[PDB]
Design a protein around this ligand. Structure first.
Ligand SMILES: CCCCCCCCCCCCCCCC(=O)O[C@H](CCCCCCCCCCC)CC(=O)N[C@H]1[C@@H](OP(=O)(O)O)O[C@H](CO[C@@H]2O[C@H](CO)[C@@H](OP(=O)(O)O)[C@H](OC(=O)C[C@@H](CCCCCCCCCCC)OC(=O)CCCCCCCCCCCCC)[C@H]2NC(=O)C[C@@H](CCCCCCCCCCC)OC(=O)CCCCCCCCCCC)[C@@H](O)[C@@H]1OC(=O)C[C@H](O)CCCCCCCCCCC
Ligand SMILES: O=C(O)[C@H]1C[C@@H](O)[C@@H](O)[C@@H]([C@H](O)CO)O1
Lengths: 58, 58
């Protein structure tokens, strides 16, 4: 060890960060009167309805 | 429909066309952590700064 033959110095680093996300929301707060389309074998009713409103410009 | 229908039962779906209501209310959460460390430190010294006449040889 007379010289710096044994003198040693070293550093090392490794950092990793990963992220991920997702969202999906929906809301509906109306009331619509529909009409029966047909009666199924079990008695369930197929209902279809439509409502058109022309407030102004569309 | 001529099928038999119970009166006091909870009207669960029973056939192909029957409809059921599903409340998702799904909530899953998983976490994982790990750590490790290792530290070693050493430091040695020795010095006279004054040597006896009889020990000057060594
Ligand atoms: C687990 C235990 C197992 C057992 C282990 C056994 C011991 C394991 C070994 C431990 C000892 C280390 C050996 C060092 C010398 C050596 O071999 O390894 C060197 C390289 C290093 C390798 C070591 C790795 C080990 C690896 C580790 C292994 C560990 C296990 C090579 C070398 O040789 N390099 C060499 C070279 O350099 P260069 O390359 O550049 O040319 O030349 C230059 C110039 O020479 C000088 O010039 C001077 C004038 O100018 C001149 O003075 P002058 O009067 O003439 O004016 C002067 O003469 C003089 O001292 C004059 C006179 C002084 C008398 C004063 C009274 C002192 C009493 C002091 C009493 C000591 C008390 C213990 O002498 C002596 O009687 C020395 C005393 C002998 C004691 C015997 C023990 C009896 C048991 C007594 C028992 C007591 C019971 C209670 C000249 N000195 C010399 O020649 C050198 C040598 C001459 C040998 C001839 C004498 C008979 C030897 C006879 C036999 C010796 C055999 C060993 O003396 C020594 O030290 C020898 C020390 C031995 C101690 C062993 C203890 C055993 C316990 C027994 C235990 C079992 C030197 O400086 C240089 O040496 C130096 O620097 C050395 C420095 O000083 C001293 C530092 C010591 C610090 C502790 C180590 C710390 C190191 C730690 C880190 C690793
Ligand atoms: O004993 C040796 O082998 C050495 C001692 C140092 O001086 C080293 O650096 C080398 C040098 O390169 C010679 O020129 O020689």
């Amino acid at each position: 060890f007379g010289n710096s033959r044994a003198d040693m110095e070293a550093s090392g680093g490794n950092s990793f960060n990963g992220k991920g996300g997702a969202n999906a929301s929906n809301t509906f707060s109306g009331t619509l009167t529909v009409t029966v389309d047909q009666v199924l074998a079990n008695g369930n009713l197929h209902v279809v309805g439509e409502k058109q409103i022309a407030i102004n410009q569309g | 429909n001529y099928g038999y229908q119970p009166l006091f039962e909870d009207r669960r779906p029973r056939n192909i066309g029957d409809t059921l209501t599903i409340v998702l209310q799904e909530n899953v959460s998983a976490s994982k952590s790990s750590s490790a460390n290792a530290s070693r430190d050493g430091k040695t010294s020795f010095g006279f700064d004054t040597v006896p006449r009889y020990l000057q040889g060594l």
